[PDB]
Design an enzyme around this catalytic site. Structure first.
Site, mmCIF file in Angstrom:
data_model
loop_
_atom_site.group_PDB
_atom_site.id
_atom_site.type_symbol
_atom_site.label_atom_id
_atom_site.label_comp_id
_atom_site.label_asym_id
_atom_site.label_seq_id
_atom_site.Cartn_x
_atom_site.Cartn_y
_atom_site.Cartn_z
ATOM 1 N N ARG A 1 39.677 -3.730 -31.216
ATOM 2 C CA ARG A 1 40.456 -4.125 -29.781
ATOM 3 C C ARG A 1 40.871 -5.747 -30.121
ATOM 4 N NH1 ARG A 1 37.194 -5.263 -24.979
ATOM 5 N NH2 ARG A 1 38.733 -5.620 -23.150
ATOM 6 N N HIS B 1 44.344 -7.400 -28.626
ATOM 7 C CA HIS B 1 44.677 -8.465 -27.307
ATOM 8 C C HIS B 1 44.986 -9.562 -27.809
ATOM 9 C CE1 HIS B 1 42.050 -6.645 -23.641
ATOM 10 N NE2 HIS B 1 42.331 -5.436 -24.188
ATOM 11 N N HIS C 1 41.571 4.622 -29.660
ATOM 12 C CA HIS C 1 41.525 4.640 -29.127
ATOM 13 C C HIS C 1 41.007 5.510 -29.897
ATOM 14 C CE1 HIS C 1 43.033 3.164 -25.232
ATOM 15 N NE2 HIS C 1 42.609 2.137 -25.450
ATOM 16 N N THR C 2 40.764 6.503 -30.632
ATOM 17 C CA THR C 2 39.469 7.624 -31.550
ATOM 18 C C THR C 2 38.152 6.350 -31.642
ATOM 19 O OG1 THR C 2 39.622 9.521 -33.136
ATOM 20 C CG2 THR C 2 40.328 6.938 -34.188
ATOM 21 N N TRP D 1 36.238 7.954 -25.705
ATOM 22 C CA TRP D 1 37.060 9.229 -26.186
ATOM 23 C C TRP D 1 36.694 10.098 -26.645
ATOM 24 C CZ3 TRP D 1 37.878 3.741 -25.729
ATOM 25 C CH2 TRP D 1 38.850 3.425 -24.409
ATOM 26 N N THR D 2 35.418 9.943 -27.464
ATOM 27 C CA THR D 2 35.541 10.637 -28.887
ATOM 28 C C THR D 2 33.998 11.123 -28.837
ATOM 29 O OG1 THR D 2 35.680 9.257 -30.531
ATOM 30 C CG2 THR D 2 37.585 10.523 -30.273
ATOM 31 N N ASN E 1 32.577 11.252 -31.755
ATOM 32 C CA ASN E 1 31.939 10.266 -33.171
ATOM 33 C C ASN E 1 33.254 9.096 -33.080
ATOM 34 O OD1 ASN E 1 34.756 11.401 -33.210
ATOM 35 N ND2 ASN E 1 34.388 12.226 -35.284
ATOM 36 N N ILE F 1 34.006 6.633 -35.997
ATOM 37 C CA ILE F 1 34.679 7.378 -37.008
ATOM 38 C C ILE F 1 36.079 7.161 -36.812
ATOM 39 C CG2 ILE F 1 34.727 9.604 -38.223
ATOM 40 C CD1 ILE F 1 32.183 7.870 -38.836
ATOM 41 N N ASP G 1 38.968 9.112 -37.331
ATOM 42 C CA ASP G 1 39.750 10.027 -36.777
ATOM 43 C C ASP G 1 41.257 10.223 -36.116
ATOM 44 O OD1 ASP G 1 38.259 10.612 -35.036
ATOM 45 O OD2 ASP G 1 37.336 12.290 -35.916
ATOM 46 N N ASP H 1 46.313 6.729 -20.731
ATOM 47 C CA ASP H 1 45.657 8.569 -22.478
ATOM 48 C C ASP H 1 46.574 9.728 -21.635
ATOM 49 O OD1 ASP H 1 44.289 6.579 -24.308
ATOM 50 O OD2 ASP H 1 42.811 7.215 -22.645
HETATM 51 C C1 HEM Z 1 48.103 1.980 -24.045
HETATM 52 C C2 HEM Z 1 47.890 0.628 -23.681
HETATM 53 C C3 HEM Z 1 46.221 0.625 -23.400
HETATM 54 C C4 HEM Z 1 45.540 0.413 -22.863
HETATM 55 C C5 HEM Z 1 45.941 0.307 -21.019
HETATM 56 C C6 HEM Z 1 45.085 -0.465 -23.594
HETATM 57 C C7 HEM Z 1 43.293 -0.367 -22.009
HETATM 58 C C8 HEM Z 1 41.792 -0.371 -22.591
HETATM 59 C C9 HEM Z 1 40.753 -0.541 -21.978
HETATM 60 C C10 HEM Z 1 40.590 -0.295 -20.484
HETATM 61 C C11 HEM Z 1 40.002 -0.601 -23.040
HETATM 62 C C12 HEM Z 1 37.909 -0.671 -22.170
HETATM 63 C C13 HEM Z 1 37.067 -1.805 -22.122
HETATM 64 C C14 HEM Z 1 36.018 -2.026 -22.145
HETATM 65 O O1 HEM Z 1 36.200 -1.371 -21.111
HETATM 66 O O2 HEM Z 1 35.266 -2.498 -22.937
HETATM 67 C C15 HEM Z 1 39.870 -0.651 -23.662
HETATM 68 C C16 HEM Z 1 39.033 -0.516 -25.274
HETATM 69 C C17 HEM Z 1 40.169 -0.321 -26.385
HETATM 70 N N1 HEM Z 1 41.218 0.109 -27.253
HETATM 71 FE FE1 HEM Z 1 42.500 0.198 -26.272
HETATM 72 N N2 HEM Z 1 44.201 0.130 -24.548
HETATM 73 C C18 HEM Z 1 45.113 -0.035 -24.461
HETATM 74 C C19 HEM Z 1 45.737 0.510 -26.651
HETATM 75 C C20 HEM Z 1 45.465 -0.051 -27.687
HETATM 76 C C21 HEM Z 1 45.738 -0.534 -28.340
HETATM 77 C C22 HEM Z 1 47.229 -0.291 -28.978
HETATM 78 C C23 HEM Z 1 44.457 -0.371 -29.319
HETATM 79 C C24 HEM Z 1 44.572 -0.280 -31.014
HETATM 80 C C25 HEM Z 1 45.671 -0.343 -31.692
HETATM 81 C C26 HEM Z 1 43.524 -0.202 -28.781
HETATM 82 C C27 HEM Z 1 42.163 -0.326 -29.291
HETATM 83 C C28 HEM Z 1 41.382 -0.164 -27.662
HETATM 84 C C29 HEM Z 1 39.607 0.213 -28.688
HETATM 85 C C30 HEM Z 1 39.118 0.502 -30.065
HETATM 86 C C31 HEM Z 1 39.085 -0.370 -27.777
HETATM 87 C C32 HEM Z 1 37.170 -0.047 -27.434
HETATM 88 C C33 HEM Z 1 36.896 -1.129 -27.894
HETATM 89 C C34 HEM Z 1 35.126 -1.462 -28.040
HETATM 90 O O3 HEM Z 1 34.383 -0.583 -27.852
HETATM 91 O O4 HEM Z 1 34.504 -2.568 -27.451
HETATM 92 N N3 HEM Z 1 44.071 -0.236 -27.377
HETATM 93 N N4 HEM Z 1 41.146 -0.364 -24.452
HETATM 94 CA CA LIG Z 2 36.661 9.533 -33.526
#
Ligand code: HEM
Ligand SMILES: [Ca+2]
EC number: 1.11.1.11
Length: 249
Positions: A37, A41, A162-163, A178-179, A181, A184, A186, A207
């Site tokens: 993340r 960002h 989001h996997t 979202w998953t 696991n 992991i 995947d 999504d």
């Molecule tokens: C397509 C548009 C996207 C939107 C609208 C979006 C939005 C969000 C939102 C709202 C969260 C939740 C934050 C929280 O409450 O902790 C989140 C988490 C996350 N996003 Fe996305 N995201 C997008 C694209 C991406 C992309 C491109 C990546 C990486 C390649 C990504 C990776 C992640 C990851 C790994 C988390 C989880 C973070 C954690 O577990 O603390 N997102 N995102």
């Molecule tokens: Ca997964």
């Protein structure tokens, strides 16, 4: 259209050593999703028309951490600071992108190529460039296509980030993984999106937008069927994201 800069051998050596230290740290602390993340960002503020924003180390500044989309990333910056201090020669820009690449590797994902040489820039971008989870396809194309310059394929592949991980009601307001696991890497993100809502698991409006767009949906179907195709497209898209604004021919 990339022409990567020359960096000294000492710089290269530090990259190699930092990659190893990041693997151990990220694995031990269970923070891969947060580091991914952070990398996202950092990079996703790029605007190709003005050449502002992008992966240039600004996310560590208070002004950028104060952006409401960046709730929770102050934790990520602080977690990494002691490790960055062991590698004074690296830019923060490189270091945060390297952490993103390592987060994908250590959770079992593809090996995303990394090229060093991003310079830290003084000035953060304006607030508001990151996508809104409540909007749909048109908004996704405006942000990834018009601002960042990525393709329709890259949008779907990168959504698969989001996997891993979860939302938090104290950060975004959304809640849960979202998953099943979430540490992991995947193709489960896509199989969950297809099979519909399931109590305990999150789908953001952004999504779900992938399911009803004529171009995105066949890519979801493909990635749900074929994890290898997902990995290949994911790695190409992550590499392009991590290099926005950097080394452009
Ligand atoms: C397509 C548009 C996207 C939107 C609208 C979006 C939005 C969000 C939102 C709202 C969260 C939740 C934050 C929280 O409450 O902790 C989140 C988490 C996350 N996003 Fe996305 N995201 C997008 C694209 C991406 C992309 C491109 C990546 C990486 C390649 C990504 C990776 C992640 C990851 C790994 C988390 C989880 C973070 C954690 O577990 O603390 N997102 N995102
Ligand atoms: Ca997964």
């Amino acid at each position: 259209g990339k022409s990567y800069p020359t960096v000294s051998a000492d710089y290269q050596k530090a990259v190699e050593k930092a990659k190893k230290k990041l693997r151990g740290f990220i694995a031990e602390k269970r923070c891969a999703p947060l580091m991914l993340r952070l990398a996202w960002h950092s990079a996703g503020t790029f605007d190709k028309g003005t050449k502002t924003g992008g992966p240039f180390g600004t996310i560590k500044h208070p002004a950028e951490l104060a952006h409401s989309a960046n709730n929770g990333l102050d934790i990520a910056v602080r977690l990494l600071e002691p490790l960055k201090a062991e590698f004074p020669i690296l830019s923060y820009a490189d270091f945060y992108q390297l952490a993103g690449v390592v987060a994908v590797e250590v959770t079992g994902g593809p090996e995303v190529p990394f090229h060093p040489g991003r310079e830290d820039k003084p000035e953060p971008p304006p607030e508001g460039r990151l996508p809104d989870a409540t909007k749909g396809s048109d908004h996704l194309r405006d942000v990834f296509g018009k601002a960042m310059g990525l393709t329709d394929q890259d949008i779907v592949a990168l959504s698969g980030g989001h996997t891993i991980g979860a939302a938090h009601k104290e950060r975004s307001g959304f809640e849960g993984p979202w998953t099943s696991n979430p540490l992991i890497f995947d193709n489960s993100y896509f199989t969950e999106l297809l099979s519909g809502e399931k109590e305990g698991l999150l789908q953001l409006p952004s999504d779900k937008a992938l399911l009803s767009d004529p171009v995105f949906r066949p890519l979801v179907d493909k990635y749900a069927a074929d994890e290898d195709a997902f990995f290949a497209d994911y790695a190409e898209a992550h590499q392009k994201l991590s290099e926005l604004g950097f080394a452009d021919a």
